[PDB]
Each structure stands twice: as C-alpha cells, then as structure tokens.
C-alpha cells in the first residue's frame, strides 16, 4: 500500500500534439485547468488550448506570439512577442490589456488569479489585471543570477516574499541560484537552491499562521531540503523551528536535481519532483521524508498544484500528464508500519484529520 495515489490524466500525443512542442518553451501549464501549446502548422503559428475538464476538444487559435500563458482560473491568455504584451479574454474575443515593455521578458508566470509576473534580464515586475494597472517593478535581479536560465518565480500568499530561480552549469553540474526578496525590508538574499515553495502553516499553540519557505537543493555537499519561517513571527506566535534534512539521490542518478515543488496545506506535505522523474514526499512540519519512488522515465518540466486532491500535476517530455497526491486512507498506516514511525503517524493523523492511527 502506498502513501500516494499516482495517475496519468492524459497523453498529449493522442491529441495530435507533436512531441517537438512538448517542452519548457512551448508548453505551459499555469494551473491544473489548462495546458497551452504553441505549434506551427505550415506557415501559421497557433496555440492549442486544452481544457483539462474537456480535453478531447481542444481550442486552436492562430497566434504570432513567442510565449503563451493561460490564467489559472479563466480562459484569459497572456501572449507576448518581444516587448509587446497582450492579454485576451478568449470567449469575449477581446483584448483586455496591452503593454509595451522596454526590455524583453525572458520568463513570465501568473502568480495569482489576477497578477502576472514578468522577469527581464535586469528585474522582476508584477502586472495586475485590475483596472488600468501597468507593470510595477518589485526588485532588481541579484548578480548571482546573471547568465542563468530563469525557471521559476513564486511568492508567498500575501506577496511579501518573492523568489526568483535560475540555473546554469558550474563545474559540470546544474547549479541553482535563487533570489529571495522581502517586499517589506527591501532586501534580497541569494540562496543556492533548485526548487522551492512557500506555505502557510499554523503551529499548535500559535494564534496565527506562519509563513514558511521550503527549498530543496543538490549542492556540492549533497541534497538538502530546508523549511524555514520567513519574517518576524506574528505577534504572540512562537517561531517555527527551522528544519534541514537530506534529499536522497541514488548512485545512478548522479546528475539529477530537484525541478519542482508543490506543498499541500490540506495535508502539510511537501511534494518534490526531480528532473529525471523521482517523486519525494516530506512532512512540512518536521521535514521527515515519507516516501520516494520514481513516477516518470522522461524528464518533467512543468508542474502545478492539483487542486482537487491537493497534490501535484505535471507534464513530461513524452506528453504524459501525471499527478501525485496523498492517498488518505493509506498514508497513516504506511507511516506506522512501513516507516515504523508511529510518532509521525499519530501527529499527521490528528493534525490533518486522517484515518489509521487507531492502531499504532
């Protein structure tokens, strides 16, 4: 019995998707609702939009964009070509917003239901879709990311802690460089890391939630995962004790590294996916490693939260759309019996209201 439920939702090649377009620069998945793929048919570039609730009927539209990212919740698409940004409501056939930058956007992502983040060579911007807003600069990029491929950007729930992630090759390995920025302190901290996420977590005896920052890295020393509270605790809160644990890589995965993280706040569990398809689950509170296995033989290049199950969903280079979540009726007896860790089993059981710690 496994503490997780693993599924394949779709094979994109069965929808006529050319495997040459299944990759980081042409396939986007900003949430579990849509997958967008940029393709060429003849001379015409097009975007293929797969509604994950009706996947066998994709929508194709002509475009002349170098990047397409769908809103997390609605059929509203952001398109760019060099410095030109345009936002379209698809169903209304209408251009909601347009903006011309003065720098190319090397990476962009929806960070909420109504805000797009833009990364240029020099800085990170936020652009709200409300009213007549234009992009607002959040911070200047730190020199430690100079030359990196930018692979992710994310924030905490209140958008006070911002995290830009890049990778490059140093000494024949893929080295991650992160920039953690505090909006309130206007200070950046460079960190060696590969994949990360924020989470809200309410400690027992604390009246307010803590804001936690979790990151995984394969460093020179080995793989490590860290879970640390950012900011001053809310007034009246105990500080969250920081955690640091090993991230395991088997001998034959000598060039693997972490590429994705999502955190379930329903289960207080961290999902970590490596470049070469390994899945890890960690307890958010203690950092204890719950489970590792391999879910993909092909590299996984994009993930999102899987909202229905509070899991993680992703696409691999073959075009399999795969998800992993906590199997709620197995996770506790797995932890009790296979990990032989009643302490954790009991804690998770009462903390997240899961069955199975009636016998330990």
């Amino acid at each position: 019995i496994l503490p997780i439920r693993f599924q394949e939702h779709l094979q994109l090649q069965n929808l006529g998707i050319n495997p040459a377009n299944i990759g980081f620069s042409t396939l986007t998945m900003e949430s579990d609702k849509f997958i967008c793929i940029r393709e060429k048919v003849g001379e015409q570039a097009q975007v293929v939009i797969i509604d994950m609730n009706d996947p066998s009927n994709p929508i194709r539209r002509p475009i002349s964009a170098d990047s397409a990212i769908m809103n997390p919740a609605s059929k509203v698409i952001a398109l760019k070509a060099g410095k030109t940004l345009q936002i379209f409501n698809i169903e209304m056939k209408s251009k909601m917003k347009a903006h011309t930058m003065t720098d190319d956007v090397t990476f962009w992502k929806w960070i909420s239901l109504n805000t797009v983040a833009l990364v240029t060579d020099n800085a990170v911007y936020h652009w709200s879709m409300e009213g007549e807003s234009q992009p607002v600069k959040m911070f200047d990029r730190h020199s430690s990311l100079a030359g990196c491929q930018i692979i992710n950007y994310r924030t905490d729930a209140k958008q006070k802690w911002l995290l830009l992630t890049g990778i490059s090759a140093q000494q024949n390995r893929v080295v991650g460089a992160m920039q953690l920025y505090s909006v309130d302190r206007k200070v950046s901290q460079p960190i060696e890391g590969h994949a990360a996420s924020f989470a809200q977590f309410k400690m027992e005896g604390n009246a307010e939630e803590s804001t936690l920052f979790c990151f995984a890295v394969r460093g020179q020393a080995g793989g490590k995962l860290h879970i640390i509270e950012v900011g001053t605790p809310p007034t009246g809160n105990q500080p969250f004790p920081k955690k640091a644990v090993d991230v395991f890589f088997p001998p034959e995965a000598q060039n693997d590294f972490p590429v994705a993280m999502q955190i379930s706040e329903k289960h207080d569990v961290v999902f970590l996916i490596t470049k070469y398809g390994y899945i890890h689950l960690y307890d958010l509170e203690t950092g204890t490693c719950i489970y590792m296995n391999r879910i993909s033989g092909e590299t996984i290049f994009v993930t999102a939260p899987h909202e229905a199950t509070a899991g993680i969903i992703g696409v691999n280079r073959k075009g399999q759309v795969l998800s992993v979540c906590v199997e709620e009726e197995n996770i506790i007896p797995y932890i009790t019996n296979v990990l032989q860790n009643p302490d954790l089993a009991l804690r998770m059981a009462v903390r997240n209201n899961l069955a199975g710690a009636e016998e330990l």
């Binding site: 439920r5 693993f6 394949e8 899945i279 296995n293 391999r294 993909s296 033989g297």
Partner: peptide, 6 residues
C-alpha cells in the same frame, strides 16, 4: 490509478 516505477 497507476503504479510508480520502482
């Protein structure tokens, strides 16, 4: 439903 690879 599916099984991991290891």
């Amino acid at each position: 439903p599916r099984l991991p690879l290891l």
